[PDB]
Structure 1
Amino acid sequence: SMTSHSWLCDGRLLCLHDPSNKNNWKIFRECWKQGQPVLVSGVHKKLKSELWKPEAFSQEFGDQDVDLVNCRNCAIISDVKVRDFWDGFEIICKRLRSEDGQPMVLKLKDWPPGEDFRDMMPTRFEDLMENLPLPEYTKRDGRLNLASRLPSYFVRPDLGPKMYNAYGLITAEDRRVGTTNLHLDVSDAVNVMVYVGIPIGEGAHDEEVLKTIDEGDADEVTKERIHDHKEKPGALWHIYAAKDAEKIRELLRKVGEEQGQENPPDHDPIHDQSWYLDQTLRKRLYEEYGVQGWAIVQFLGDAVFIPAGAPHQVHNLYSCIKVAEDFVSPEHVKHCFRLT
């Protein structure tokens, strides 16, 4: 029956159940003070579902010019129509094919571009911003959002939100690649899964999704959300505490060296955004450096709260539309300060 919250990651991750509850801050704020990520479920039930479909984006914006990335090999597909991405989002037989004749796993780069989301999509902007959880933290004008209140001694976030659109990774070989590589942000962020597309053609690809979640180190309760309630899983995240960022840099310098990269001893493999931690590298981080992370499956309507300074990576299971907003909480403002 209905409850305020539950725990994932064996007690280490807060899951809030009611996204608009005026009392959520009472449960949120101690987990957030400790540097933990937080999950909030149910945001899809608050949104106008017609605004967030792949077919509407194609119909309304399809003649815009964009670049795509081939997630398998990082090859850039320059200066194509955005309809060429959207029309293959769920229908595999419409997808652009690589030279080997296979349908590609594509990411749409920087769309809408820079800060243009609000100008290009005013009705979507209103629908998202009015339904974000923890609104004193996440709204542009929230009382606990310092973004508009800080001097130039602090790195300030760009005007958001930002959309993140990409197909699902499909094969056993795809398990070792990221949709978004390991990186960190100096602001806090909330990332909302507004649509999950489960394809058709080569549709029935449900067994390799279970193997990816299992190999991804997902907890036993997370595995129950599929088997028992038939929720749509979108993406597998790994998030690490901000305090563990330098130990992760030491691991990736050592692995770069082993693989014959020629790197100065101070170079920053996290800022480079060139690594995805696969099962092998995650085990090595735990065993050799004593660092544990949070493995998080983001279902349709889940909002993931990512603490400033926390290294994180994203692997899409199915085709995803995500929308994210940056904010600056008082708990984590040290991470954007420009001195010492």
Structure 2
Amino acid sequence: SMTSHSWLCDGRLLCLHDPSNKNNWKIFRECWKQGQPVLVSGVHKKLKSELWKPEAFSQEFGDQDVDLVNCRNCAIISDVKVRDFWDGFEIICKRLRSEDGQPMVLKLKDWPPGEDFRDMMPTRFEDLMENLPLPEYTKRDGRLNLASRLPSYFVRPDLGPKMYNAYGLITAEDRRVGTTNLHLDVSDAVNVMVYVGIPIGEGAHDEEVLKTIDEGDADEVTKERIHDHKEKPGALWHIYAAKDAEKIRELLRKVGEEQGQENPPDHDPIHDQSWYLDQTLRKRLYEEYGVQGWAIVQFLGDAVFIPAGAPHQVHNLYSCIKVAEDFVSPEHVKHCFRLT
């Protein structure tokens, strides 16, 4: 039977089932006021699927110059053609190779650049903005989005959306690395998985994706959604409550010290965006600081709602295209205020 919603993370995460249901706000707003993230699927069924394919981005924009990041060692690959990224998205034998002769796990940096998404891609902009869930919160002019309504005493978000494009992490050693490192945003955000690429050549990558999700602390219901082979898993997230940010900073200052970093006692390891919390660091955070997070597997068409101030990190399981919009809910406006 069709249902309005279900629970993940042992009851701690709301999962809404119908992205366009006008009653979603009634269930959403209680979880959101408590500082929890929220998951919505089925957003892929609302989109024009031909607009969000890697082959179309290559054909239409392939000649633009970009930088890439090597996710395994953070090296920057400067001033290459965006087609050099898109043509290896799902075919491993087309990927740029590191000096060891291995195909690289790459992230496309700042593309489209700054606030240019709407200008470069007006049909994609329309298709996304018209199908965002919780539209009173997430649209530029939604009645519960204060972005356009606030004075300069508040940090306002950039004009979005922003697109996040990266290959999936592959090996047992890749389990300890992030696609996006631990950081926080002063605005709220919704992140939609619009495309998941499951590769070929080295296309027998069944078991290590399962081990990554299990070691990632994914709940029993999430594990049932994986065993059921009906939906493509894109990325593993860890999200922490905004109120736990300083305890995470204390852990990371202590680990930096143990590892011989030489850092002023006030320096901000979350703002540095230099850490990924692996299985060891997540266990230590729980045991030594009493901090529990949310381990979330974002499937194709899942929209992840990230509360303002909530530290978070992303680990791609397969090749992903994600599109994110920032907004300012009245529930969390304190996080962007410039005084006390």
Which band: TM-score by shorter chain?
Answer: over 0.9
Deviations, residues 148-179 of structure 1 (Å, cap 9, x unaligned): 00000000000000000000000000000000
Bigger mean CA offset, 224-233 vs 262-271: 224-233
SS in 2 for 1:314: strand
Deviations, residues 41-90 of structure 1 (Å, cap 9, x unaligned): 10000000000000000000000000000000000000000000000000
Q: Give how far 1:271 is off.
A: 0.1
C-alpha distance in 2 between matches for 1:273 and 1:325: 20
SS in 1 for 2:297: strand
C-alpha distance in 1 between matches for 2:64 and 2:41: 33
Identity percentage of aligned residues: 100
Compute the RMSD of aligned alpha carbons: 0.4
Question: Which aligned runs of 4 or more in structure 1 are off by greater than 3 angstroms?
Answer: none
Deviations, residues 266-306 of structure 1 (Å, cap 9, x unaligned): 00000000000000000000000000000000000000000
Query: Match for residue 145 of structure 1?
Result: 145
SS in 2 for 1:276: coil
Q: Give how far 1:228 is off.
A: 2.0
Query: Match for residue 322 of structure 1?
Result: 322
Q: Give how far 1:16 is off.
A: 0.1
C-alpha distance in 2 between matches for 1:303 and 1:17: 11
C-alpha distance in 1 between matches for 2:151 and 2:230: 47
C-alpha distance in 2 between matches for 1:137 and 1:88: 36
C-alpha distance in 2 between matches for 1:13 and 1:229: 22
Query: Match for residue 193 of structure 2?
Result: 193
Give the TM-score, by structure 1 length.
1.00
SS in 1 for 2:228: helix
C-alpha distance in 2 between matches for 1:298 and 1:107: 18
Cα distance change on mapping 1:101 and 1:192 into 2, 3 Å: same
SS in 2 for 1:322: strand
C-alpha distance in 2 between matches for 1:115 and 1:2: 38
Deviations, residues 215-271 of structure 1 (Å, cap 9, x unaligned): 000000001112125210000000000000000000000000000000000000000
- What are the within-5 Å matches in structure 2 for residues 27-38 of structure 1? 27-38=27-38
SS in 1 for 2:31: helix
Deviations, residues 303-329 of structure 1 (Å, cap 9, x unaligned): 000000000000000000000000000
C-alpha distance in 2 between matches for 1:320 and 1:52: 11
C-alpha distance in 2 between matches for 1:135 and 1:146: 13
Bigger mean CA offset, 31-40 vs 219-228: 219-228
Deviations, residues 71-122 of structure 1 (Å, cap 9, x unaligned): 0000000000000000000000000000000000000000000000000000
C-alpha distance in 2 between matches for 1:286 and 1:219: 16
SS in 2 for 1:151: coil
Bigger mean CA offset, 158-167 vs 217-226: 217-226
C-alpha distance in 1 between matches for 2:206 and 2:27: 35
Deviations, residues 2-46 of structure 1 (Å, cap 9, x unaligned): 100000000000000000000000000000000000000100000
C-alpha distance in 1 between matches for 2:228 and 2:85: 33
SS in 2 for 1:229: coil
Query: Match for residue 79 of structure 1?
Result: 79
SS in 1 for 2:217: coil
Query: Match for residue 216 of structure 1?
Result: 216
C-alpha distance in 2 between matches for 1:149 and 1:86: 38
Query: Match for residue 56 of structure 1?
Result: 56
Deviations, residues 109-139 of structure 1 (Å, cap 9, x unaligned): 0000000000000000000000000000000
C-alpha distance in 2 between matches for 1:178 and 1:141: 34
Q: How many residues are matched?
A: 340
C-alpha distance in 2 between matches for 1:140 and 1:225: 33
Q: Give how far 1:206 is off.
A: 1.4
Query: Match for residue 270 of structure 1?
Result: 270
SS in 2 for 1:60: helix
C-alpha distance in 1 between matches for 2:229 and 2:195: 18
C-alpha distance in 2 between matches for 1:213 and 1:226: 9
SS in 1 for 2:149: coil
SS in 2 for 1:107: strand
Query: Match for residue 173 of structure 1?
Result: 173
SS in 2 for 1:324: strand
SS in 1 for 2:147: coil
